[PDB]
Design an enzyme around this catalytic site. Structure first.
Site, PDB file in Angstrom:
ATOM      1  N   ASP A 162      35.918  42.277 -14.936  1.00 18.26           N
ATOM      2  CA  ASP A 162      35.719  42.653 -14.042  1.00 18.26           C
ATOM      3  C   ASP A 162      35.616  41.147 -12.739  1.00 18.26           C
ATOM      4  O   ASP A 162      34.737  40.717 -12.433  1.00 18.26           O
ATOM      5  CB  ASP A 162      33.654  42.751 -14.502  1.00 18.26           C
ATOM      6  N   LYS A 169      19.912  35.062 -16.835  1.00 17.00           N
ATOM      7  CA  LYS A 169      20.585  36.987 -16.200  1.00 17.00           C
ATOM      8  C   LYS A 169      19.621  37.409 -17.110  1.00 17.00           C
ATOM      9  O   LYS A 169      19.253  37.270 -18.588  1.00 17.00           O
ATOM     10  CB  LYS A 169      21.671  36.825 -16.538  1.00 17.00           C
ATOM     11  N   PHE A 186      24.107  44.337 -13.516  1.00 17.19           N
ATOM     12  CA  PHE A 186      23.254  44.766 -15.062  1.00 17.19           C
ATOM     13  C   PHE A 186      22.644  43.444 -14.944  1.00 17.19           C
ATOM     14  O   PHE A 186      21.638  43.999 -15.877  1.00 17.19           O
ATOM     15  CB  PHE A 186      24.759  44.516 -15.823  1.00 17.19           C
ATOM     16  N   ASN A 210      31.874  36.944  -9.652  1.00 16.54           N
ATOM     17  CA  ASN A 210      32.338  36.574 -10.685  1.00 16.54           C
ATOM     18  C   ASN A 210      32.818  35.218 -11.067  1.00 16.54           C
ATOM     19  O   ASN A 210      33.823  35.438 -12.248  1.00 16.54           O
ATOM     20  CB  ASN A 210      32.861  37.493 -12.137  1.00 16.54           C
ATOM     21  N   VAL A 252      19.466  40.759 -13.267  1.00 13.79           N
ATOM     22  CA  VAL A 252      18.689  40.343 -12.189  1.00 13.79           C
ATOM     23  C   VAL A 252      19.043  38.832 -13.158  1.00 13.79           C
ATOM     24  O   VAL A 252      18.728  38.155 -13.463  1.00 13.79           O
ATOM     25  CB  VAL A 252      17.802  39.832 -11.415  1.00 13.79           C
ATOM     26  N   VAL A 253      19.724  36.802 -12.082  1.00 17.66           N
ATOM     27  CA  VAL A 253      19.984  35.903 -12.433  1.00 17.66           C
ATOM     28  C   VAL A 253      19.019  35.041 -11.422  1.00 17.66           C
ATOM     29  O   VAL A 253      18.539  34.829 -10.231  1.00 17.66           O
ATOM     30  CB  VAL A 253      21.382  35.408 -11.940  1.00 17.66           C
ATOM     31  N   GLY A 273      23.531  40.763 -10.294  1.00 16.45           N
ATOM     32  CA  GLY A 273      24.701  41.419 -10.275  1.00 16.45           C
ATOM     33  C   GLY A 273      24.838  42.999 -10.786  1.00 16.45           C
ATOM     34  O   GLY A 273      23.623  43.622 -10.140  1.00 16.45           O
ATOM     35  N   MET A 326      18.686  33.676  -7.876  1.00 14.43           N
ATOM     36  CA  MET A 326      18.962  33.207  -7.369  1.00 14.43           C
ATOM     37  C   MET A 326      20.670  34.643  -6.921  1.00 14.43           C
ATOM     38  O   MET A 326      21.746  34.317  -6.259  1.00 14.43           O
ATOM     39  CB  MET A 326      20.207  32.921  -7.843  1.00 14.43           C
ATOM     40  N   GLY A 327      20.152  35.971  -7.232  1.00 11.34           N
ATOM     41  CA  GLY A 327      21.222  36.715  -7.086  1.00 11.34           C
ATOM     42  C   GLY A 327      20.873  38.116  -7.879  1.00 11.34           C
ATOM     43  O   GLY A 327      19.943  37.562  -8.780  1.00 11.34           O
TER      44      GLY A 327
HETATM   45  C1  LIG Z   1      25.594  33.218  -7.575  1.00 10.67           C
HETATM   46  C2  LIG Z   1      23.672  33.243  -7.839  1.00 10.67           C
HETATM   47  C3  LIG Z   1      23.634  34.572  -9.060  1.00 10.67           C
HETATM   48  O1  LIG Z   1      23.731  32.339  -9.171  1.00 10.67           O
HETATM   49  C4  LIG Z   1      23.699  30.773  -8.196  1.00 10.67           C
HETATM   50  N1  LIG Z   1      23.711  30.999  -7.357  1.00 10.67           N
HETATM   51  C5  LIG Z   1      23.115  29.987  -6.215  1.00 10.67           C
HETATM   52  N2  LIG Z   1      23.242  29.479  -5.223  1.00 10.67           N
HETATM   53  N3  LIG Z   1      23.304  28.194  -5.254  1.00 10.67           N
HETATM   54  C6  LIG Z   1      22.830  27.377  -3.443  1.00 10.67           C
HETATM   55  C7  LIG Z   1      22.443  25.868  -3.349  1.00 10.67           C
HETATM   56  O2  LIG Z   1      22.098  25.692  -2.285  1.00 10.67           O
HETATM   57  C8  LIG Z   1      22.201  27.599  -1.909  1.00 10.67           C
HETATM   58  C9  LIG Z   1      22.072  26.702   0.070  1.00 10.67           C
HETATM   59  C10 LIG Z   1      23.489  27.616  -2.565  1.00 10.67           C
HETATM   60  C11 LIG Z   1      21.675  27.742  -2.512  1.00 10.67           C
HETATM   61  C12 LIG Z   1      23.419  28.036  -6.215  1.00 10.67           C
HETATM   62  C13 LIG Z   1      23.219  28.383  -7.111  1.00 10.67           C
HETATM   63  C14 LIG Z   1      23.883  28.278  -8.507  1.00 10.67           C
HETATM   64  C15 LIG Z   1      23.489  30.063  -9.678  1.00 10.67           C
HETATM   65  C16 LIG Z   1      24.033  29.913 -10.541  1.00 10.67           C
HETATM   66  O3  LIG Z   1      23.942  29.055 -11.482  1.00 10.67           O
HETATM   67  N4  LIG Z   1      24.828  31.449 -10.791  1.00 10.67           N
HETATM   68  C17 LIG Z   1      24.725  31.785 -12.922  1.00 10.67           C
HETATM   69  C18 LIG Z   1      25.467  30.285 -13.035  1.00 10.67           C
HETATM   70  C19 LIG Z   1      26.394  30.478 -14.670  1.00 10.67           C
HETATM   71  C20 LIG Z   1      26.102  32.174 -14.904  1.00 10.67           C
HETATM   72  N5  LIG Z   1      26.002  32.803 -13.735  1.00 10.67           N
HETATM   73  C21 LIG Z   1      26.209  34.352 -13.579  1.00 10.67           C
HETATM   74  C22 LIG Z   1      26.457  34.674 -15.116  1.00 10.67           C
HETATM   75  C23 LIG Z   1      25.176  35.573 -14.646  1.00 10.67           C
HETATM   76  F1  LIG Z   1      24.178  34.507 -14.724  1.00 10.67           F
HETATM   77  C24 LIG Z   1      25.375  32.706 -12.276  1.00 10.67           C
HETATM   78  O4  LIG Z   1      24.639  33.515 -11.788  1.00 10.67           O
END
Ligand SMILES: CC(C)Oc1nc2nn([C@]34CO[C@](C)(C3)C4)cc2cc1C(=O)Nc1cccn([C@H]2C[C@H]2F)c1=O
Length: 282
Positions: free
Chosen positions: A140, A47, A31, A145, A33-34, A29, A26-27
């Site tokens: 941060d 994470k 520090f 975030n 990978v999520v 940071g 999903m992405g």
């Molecule tokens: C930002 C990325 C890393 O996270 C996500 N991206 C997402 N994109 N989509 C969609 C759905 O339809 C789309 C077209 C947009 C894809 C849903 C998502 C949910 C998450 C998520 O729930 N991410 C976290 C939850 C809780 C905490 N933290 C941070 C502490 C680190 F872990 C999170 O990062």
């Protein structure tokens, strides 16, 4: 508490491909990978942490702040896993991802309306206010975030740098968001306010906080451009909206500008920032 085998199992073995291609990433940071996981009938974000190995400390700190700070505008931490090849934190899944990604329309999501940008800025300030009231400094604050649930409620995340005036010999943070005094080692909640000013410029402009191919490279520098009358606010307003009234956009810019004062003691406190954002949509 979670085991590495189970977190591994529900993330398709930590499938590093993006979700759209069929993986679980999903992405990432600075520090870790999520990954998206599906465990006990619940979607979660996982994470996996990945700087010296001792620099483990972050995992440790993230758990202590989550225990203390629970609020409508703060992400909820579900559990963790210290057993296994890597360490892992499990959070409540946020269906609209990060504010950074929604501002860039990453993966084809619709542009955020001005009305919803206004509600998100208020929600994020509320989360900051809860932290400063509980004598925490985030250190941060940035749009990556700030996460968004299914109602587009803003929730502050990523407490691995948070802390309970004072200097540190270990300066941390994200430079494009950092106040001058924080770059030089100071620990103060006044620095979180500065970072939040940058986030408010992201919300107004739709632009990232740093862009090496852009003039100026740092988004916080458009404040001086506007002051010098080289550009106007209107030049910088995100074109991907058709409900942005001039009056309220300028009002949020004025908030962003006061937050971006070079001198920490000339910045508003988070309560003033809350009040001004409230007055914007009143
Ligand atoms: C930002 C990325 C890393 O996270 C996500 N991206 C997402 N994109 N989509 C969609 C759905 O339809 C789309 C077209 C947009 C894809 C849903 C998502 C949910 C998450 C998520 O729930 N991410 C976290 C939850 C809780 C905490 N933290 C941070 C502490 C680190 F872990 C999170 O990062």
């Amino acid at each position: 508490s979670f085991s590495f085998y189970e977190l591994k199992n529900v993330t398709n073995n930590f499938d590093e491909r993006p979700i759209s291609v069929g993986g679980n990433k999903m992405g990432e940071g600075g520090f870790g990978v999520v990954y998206k996981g599906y465990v006990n009938n619940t979607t979660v974000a996982v994470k996996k942490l990945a700087i010296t190995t001792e620099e483990k400390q972050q995992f440790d700190q993230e758990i202590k702040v989550m225990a203390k700070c629970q609020h409508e505008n703060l992400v909820e931490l579900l559990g963790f896993s210290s057993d296994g090849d890597d360490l892992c934190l499990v959070y409540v899944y946020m269906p609209n991802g990060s504010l950074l990604d929604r501002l860039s329309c990453l993966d084809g999501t619709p542009p955020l309306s001005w009305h919803m940008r206004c509600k998100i800025a208020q929600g994020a300030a509320n989360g900051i206010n809860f932290l400063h009231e509980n004598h925490h400094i985030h250190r941060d604050i940035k749009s990556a975030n700030i996460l968004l649930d299914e109602a587009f409620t803003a929730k502050i995340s990523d407490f691995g740098l948070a802390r309970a005036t004072v200097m540190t010999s270990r300066i941390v943070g994200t430079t494009a968001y950092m106040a001058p005094e924080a770059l030089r080692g100071e620990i103060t909640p006044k620095s979180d306010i500065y970072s939040f000013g940058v986030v408010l410029l992201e919300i107004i402009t739709g632009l990232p906080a740093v862009d090496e191919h852009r003039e100026p490279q740092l988004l916080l520098d458009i404040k001086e451009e506007i002051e010098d009358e080289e550009k106007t606010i209107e030049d910088y307003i995100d074109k991907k909206m058709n409900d942005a009234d001039s009056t309220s956009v300028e009002a949020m810019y004025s908030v962003a500008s006061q937050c971006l004062h070079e001198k920490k003691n000339k910045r508003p406190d988070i309560k003033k920032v809350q009040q001004l954002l409230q007055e914007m949509t009143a």
